[PDB]
Design a protein around this ligand. Sequence first.
Ligand SMILES: [Ho+3]
Lengths: 60, 60
Amino acid sequence: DDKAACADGIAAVKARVEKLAPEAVPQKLKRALKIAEREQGEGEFDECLEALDDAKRALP
Amino acid sequence: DDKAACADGIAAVKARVEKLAPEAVPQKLKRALKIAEREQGEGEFDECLEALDDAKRALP
Ligand SMILES: [Ho+3]
């Protein structure tokens, strides 16, 4: 469901980001991940998924 | 728009709540107002309006 997809998506995006040089991680990518995590914590798993969409589009 | 409606709705619900004995304000009402304010601060003015709907239904 959205909750599992949100958690899986956060891990998937992080795993891809963690293969980047840290000094090269865009601020927009960090912010999108943080928004996703905030919304996950609020139980807005659907909004987490939309923030993950933004994070993926911010990947170099 | 949703932003103005959210701000107006927070004030409207508070004005009605502030006419209650404070020791008698339901916890569910306080929580709904706080959620609305959190979502307002996140710029989710639509989600604020849905939390305000819950607050109104929690009025004694
Ligand atoms: Ho939110």
